[PDB]
Amino acid sequence: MALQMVTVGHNIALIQPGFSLMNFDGQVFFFGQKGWPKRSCPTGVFHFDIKQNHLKLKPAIFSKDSCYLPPLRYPATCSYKKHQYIIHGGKTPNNELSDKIYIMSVACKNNKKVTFRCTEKDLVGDVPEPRYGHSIDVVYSRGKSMGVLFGGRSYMPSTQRTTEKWNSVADCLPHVFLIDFEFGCATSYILPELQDGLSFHVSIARNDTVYILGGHSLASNIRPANLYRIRVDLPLGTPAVNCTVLPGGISVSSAILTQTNNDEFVIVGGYQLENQKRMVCSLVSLGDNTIEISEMETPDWTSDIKHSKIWFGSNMGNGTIFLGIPGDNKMSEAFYFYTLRCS
Amino acid sequence: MALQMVTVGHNIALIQPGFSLMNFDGQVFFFGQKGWPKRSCPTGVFHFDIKQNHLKLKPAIFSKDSCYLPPLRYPATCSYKKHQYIIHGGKTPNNELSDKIYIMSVACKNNKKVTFRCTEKDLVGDVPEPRYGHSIDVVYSRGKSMGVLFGGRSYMPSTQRTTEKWNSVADCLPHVFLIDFEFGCATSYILPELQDGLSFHVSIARNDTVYILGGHSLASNIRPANLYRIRVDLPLGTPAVNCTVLPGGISVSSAILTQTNNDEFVIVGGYQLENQKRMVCSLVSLGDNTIEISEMETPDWTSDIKHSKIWFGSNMGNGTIFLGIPGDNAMSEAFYFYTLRC
Amino acid sequence: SGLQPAVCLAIRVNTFLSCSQYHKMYRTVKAITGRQIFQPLHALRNAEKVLLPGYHPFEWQPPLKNVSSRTDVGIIDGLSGLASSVDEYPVDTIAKRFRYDSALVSALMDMEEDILEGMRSQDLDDYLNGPFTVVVKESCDGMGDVSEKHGSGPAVPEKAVRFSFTVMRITIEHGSQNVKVFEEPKPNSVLCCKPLCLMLADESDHETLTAILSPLIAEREAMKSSELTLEMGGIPRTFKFIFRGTGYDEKLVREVEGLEASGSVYICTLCDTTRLEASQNLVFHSITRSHAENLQRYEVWRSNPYHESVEELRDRVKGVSAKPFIETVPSIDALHCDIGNAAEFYKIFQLEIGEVYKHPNASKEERKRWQATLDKHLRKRMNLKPIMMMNGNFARKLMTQETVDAVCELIPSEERHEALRELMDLYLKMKPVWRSSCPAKECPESLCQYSFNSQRFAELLSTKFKYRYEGKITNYFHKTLAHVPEIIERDGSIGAWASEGNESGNKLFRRFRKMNARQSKCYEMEDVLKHHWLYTSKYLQKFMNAHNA
Amino acid sequence: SGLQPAVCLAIRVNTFLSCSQYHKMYRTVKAITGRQIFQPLHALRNAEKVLLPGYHPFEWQPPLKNVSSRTDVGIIDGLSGLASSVDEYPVDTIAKRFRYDSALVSALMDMEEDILEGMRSQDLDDYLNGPFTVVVKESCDGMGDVSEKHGSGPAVPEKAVRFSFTVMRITIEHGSQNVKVFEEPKPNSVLCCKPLCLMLADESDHETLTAILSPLIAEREAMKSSELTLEMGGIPRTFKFIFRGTGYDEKLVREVEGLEASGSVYICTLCDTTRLEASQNLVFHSITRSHAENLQRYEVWRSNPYHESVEELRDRVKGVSAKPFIETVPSIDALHCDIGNAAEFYKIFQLEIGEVYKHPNASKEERKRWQATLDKHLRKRMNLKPIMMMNGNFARKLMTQETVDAVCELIPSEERHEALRELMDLYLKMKPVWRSSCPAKECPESLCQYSFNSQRFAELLSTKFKYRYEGKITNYFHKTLAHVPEIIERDGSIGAWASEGNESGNKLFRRFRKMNARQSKCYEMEDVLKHHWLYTSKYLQKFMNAHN
DNA sequence: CACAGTGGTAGTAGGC
DNA sequence: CACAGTGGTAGT
DNA sequence: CAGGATAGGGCTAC
DNA sequence: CAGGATAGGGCTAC
DNA sequence: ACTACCACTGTGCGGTAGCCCTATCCTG
DNA sequence: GCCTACTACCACTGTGCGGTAGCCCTATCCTG
Ligand SMILES: [Mg+2]
Ligand SMILES: [Mg+2]
Ligand SMILES: [Mg+2]
Ligand SMILES: [Mg+2]
Ligand SMILES: [Zn+2]
Ligand SMILES: [Zn+2]
Question: Which ligand minimizes its atom distance to the CA of C209?
């Protein structure tokens, strides 16, 4: 809705597609920097401080017991609750996929210079696989919080992976991994509703259900207008997860999801297909067992954006959307950036 | 003596070897600019303003009755008494040589906008061939006055100029043209003492006489340490001229001549050889009929200077020498500049 | 069954083979086949002697004023005796030139075959010593980014100047008709722009430029006054020379024609009009600026006989404050015209993206954002990468209705769409004229309607681009709109007379400096000049065209 | 007649003849002589197949993990299935690569005759199938100023990355000793650095670089753990492979070996020493680092198993904050060592001109004035012009005793004159060692005395130049002084293992992109790679040395 | 101690 | 309407 | 008002 | 304190 | 074996990142 | 005696590496 071109001159080159913002008590934090962490910010996590619509990436630091995680681009970022961000998968700047989980909590807040605890979490049980473009989102069944990890892109399995098609990605087997974090375990669930691998799909967990929206399936190269609803029921014993392919789903990929109000998210941006990006921001108003994908007032998209073949971003967290578009000339102006404040 | 590295701004590219400074106003004016006068300074003349070792070439302007003379490289520049400046010859930026004389007077001083009546004095008689590196200098004999134009390179005559040696210069026949600016009449004089055509010589004009001093003879490619004294007499007849090669001369060329104090000059720089430029200054003290070329204390030439093959300059007029040296050549700064005061 | 030295030289040259690469190939073919198929390097140099200036005896029956009658001089020093004495003006320049008369003789005797072929095609006895008027396009250009070399030699600038000449048309006066026994079909070809002086100077350095060229200009002025008796085909043919200095970029024209820089109130190297008057009238301007007029005007400037202030004096001489040292033709560099006009259309596209017809008070950064929008789009649609400085290829890809159709996707006003599409339709109905080598043949209907199309273009700049063109106008728009019809009536073509040849030859200058020249300041220009002369030798281009004939 | 298509192709490529110019020459010859001396372009293009990868049948035992056994694979998209989808990372790069398998195979089969000649010259049966250890000089360098072309395709940077490989040393195990059946006589020749991947990317763009090269690195690791059976000279010969990644400049080494930039307090890609420690010790440093150690150290940095601050953690890993992407050898880029050491000597000259040993502080523009003095003089005396960024030829005309004499002419203190002359005498008693392709055979006692001359260089640096080397030292001085002897006793040479070859290959990449390739983004890299492989063909080079 | 040129002499090998 | 390539590929 | 960012320059590599 | 330099940006060519 | 086609080239044309350390600056 | 062919020599190249100049008009900024 409220579009405003952001300015950043220093550390701009670090904002690459696949970056993942994390809202920690209003303080927005960049992650997924371009390249490996430089000694300016050896962590790769930055304060995403937009003042007067000028963006400053302030080098953040980590805890001592922290795991200095790699800059993961296109990982699965959720908020477990503490308010620690789960980060699964992602492309290590070596174009390696991370099987690791990274629970980035905030350990200490001083100067508004926040120290992080990027605790590595290993996944006992059914480790999903090294993947990216996937979704992780915590459901809350019976007071038990459990990450729901739905597939994204992964490199071909090392058995089928060839160097002539090394970086060839396949949408992971569409499975719903129940990542337990108090148990560090993951449990895959082959849902018959999810048989077309997805990636770069916006995912919305409200209480116990994860609305998987849009996405892209390489097995089809289409962005299916699907709205899978993965309802998770966690009894004390073996869990349960049931998907229901609801209608009204939108065909969008790489979309950004920001919660404007409680149970009212905005799926802005993304892609309807390759050379046609979703320039129509959508509203997703949720309920206990319902979901409505409206079509918000298409923002005053700048010509730079309307004509930007590629466009990426992440949910700053409050109601805002950081949104970058390649504006390169070939050069610390590769990506012209914008903030879309919704409500 | 006081070598002061000078900074130039926005116009450093115009200061080229062969430039001429003219001291009217007590404020020095730069005339011979690189290339033709750009509409920034359509006149080529500039307010040469050294202020705190910074050079500000402020575009001057000419009068209405003026001739917008070309930027002449290595012309024959003299002050003449009004306080005009004679500019004979020089390489027009088209590498042509001017035959015209240009008399830069001064009028309409606005405290910022000094203007020059750059009259064009044309010569009738034994007009000096288009040349440069020569030395026009005004003598005052019997209250009258004449300009002793001597020497100078000139392109080979069109009767003998070939396009394969088009820019080949011959030291003009050694002749002392008495140039009557009173009427613009050039009277040439063959003097046997001047056997070799000189150029880029210093010329020190005391009353009635011009001390030619340390030029470069191209026929020989040598810088003779001669001190020819052209004694000019104007007894309201055929203007008599007797040259006299004096012992005490110095083998220099393209040297800058300042008049620090009256009857006393400083010959700074120049060249003793293409192999070695002249680092020793030379005090030239003048008596009404004598000359003594002492050797001043060699200023503390900056290594920038000491190790610059080429170095050019001009007498600002306050006993000081604006001398430049080739700088770091892509477009860092064509030359570094210094105001060696004395 | 070996090849001749001349044809092996043609191969070496036109195939850009260095003498080292050619020797590798030759020794390889000699050691593999066992027989000498290619002629060794020494034979190639002995052949070059024939194609290079200073071989064919010639005589100007009016002996060239100030030019040596010697017909043996080839690659002489471009300094031309310029005193490198330390007392003199520093010659920070390496210039190697051919003597213009020797060079013309070698160029003719190189196209001797073509001259006779065209005399025969015209049913004219190929023994006619009639006076051939050789219309030559003398073309100078500056080229920077000329990496200076280590080694002994003057501290030359990283900038060069290629004075070239293109024999454009040889017309013999057969009594009642000026039949053209030769006409350069590809006049802007690099195979025809014959190098005449490779100076390692800046064209902005007027002092050095003049020191180096005024010999060429003196040879040119002498040859303007002489007939060249030259023995070709066994007959002593005589050639008159019409030199036409059109291959000069307007910057260089103004430099050498005594004019103020391109930026100026005085806008054309052809007419004595002001940028304002040129943005108001925009078509009806007569070609007035001649080298002779510019000389008279510099003499007026220097002399200021009417005791006029610098302003009224400069408006009397109309910007001629410097002295001309080259007699360029009042003409249009079709190359740099297309480039400047495409840069102006690029700016127009920027401003239409910015709707400067509505918001003429942008701030230096939305202007940059419009430039970036245009960059991204032309890269997306027209596949045009954003280049720092408009080149001719970007220009001829940008001056297409395809490019306007793309750019209009960035303008939210179909009115401006129509304006831009009309502007480009007119510009593309006009460009064939001042780009064709013979518009009366390549685009006669565009030349017929060029006055009308240019009037329409000018009123479209005055109406729908009142911004960017109220009281201001690019020099090349003025040339395109006002002078082209007259330049065609005068010279029959404009693109034929472009610097495109000498510029394209800058590419070969670079290629030969890197790959066909001794990498020494003392020899680079000599070798490049030699090899770029051989490259432009039609004698060798024939051998390389024997596949056809 | 008498000219086979392979010979015509050798003439074409080695003479840098474009197919277009070669066709001009061939048709001109065919029209003038009538005979078809030169073979037509199609015959050349068919001969290329024999020389390009994807022609000779080979196998790997064990078969390469994650590598296609398909021997029909020549030039492939370096993207390697990398999705250019808008949803994915915006890969803006034209990458074309030979499959490392096929590239090694074609490079060997191209040296088939050379290998046989050398095993005959080594008193061996040229029918030996014994395992040849093929020591390969992996070489990668970013180029820059690689002007991108208009047209279809990505918005590639105006930069390139050329992963090459020089087969440096084929040695067969003839019982006990590893007899060397082939040694690249000119290892840093552009005629030998076989191109393997040309990507229109930036080496500083680690994401793209890695996406393009990790196929190559995967092939390289597979080949390390395998043995290439290849039908050479009618016999199936087995080639073990030793990939020595050394033609990487220190910047790129650090990028790919997980290290901080060269400016990092952690100064070497070989030792875990701080720039300060390296300025204090300056000669006594083992070669600590390695791809395996750097991998363990990135794993430490990531897991932080000791729960350390970023500073003490960095110290624990010694600058390895990034994951080593390439298994480069902890060696020295002799080329860029010369470059950097000469740039440091150049600055040293600037300073001596400034008497900084007397004037610790000094104006920045006064330092520019010193640099201009040095420039004017080096131009006067050493005739070598001022260059923006130091190049090797400047570093060679400058790392000269007459150069230091010229500079001394700019220094009034003859004590500094002797300091500089001794510094250069030592640097030139040392430079043969890390520039010689075989210092044991080109500068044996300059090497035996290398530890001593380096100790003396360090003494002079920390005593007579301590205004420049107190708590700081250039990384290439540290390498030159500390690690060169270790690298000699390990690799046998340093110059042989330099990026020099791949940089000359950058020259030829420019030449081929401008004059021997389709000027379209879709095909520039494919064609440049094809032609630069042929240029490096020892077979075509043989044909071009037929006069011998 | 990079190396493959870069071309034009200079000089040196062969043929007569 | 610059033009001479630039190499492969298809098509005579 | 000493501590925690920022800018900028020196320095390392390219 | 309105007039005469200066800086800087727009604009023209390269 | 040629030759066109292809969509483009160059000629137009004149230092970078990163690390780090310190000097600013900017606090609550 | 020549004439032709080969080759060294020279002293360097590039690969190492990422908008100018002018005019001129206006906004700044002196300026006693
Ligand atoms: Mg020009
Ligand atoms: Mg140019
Ligand atoms: Mg590089
Ligand atoms: Mg590099
Ligand atoms: Zn006009
Ligand atoms: Zn080390």
Answer: 1
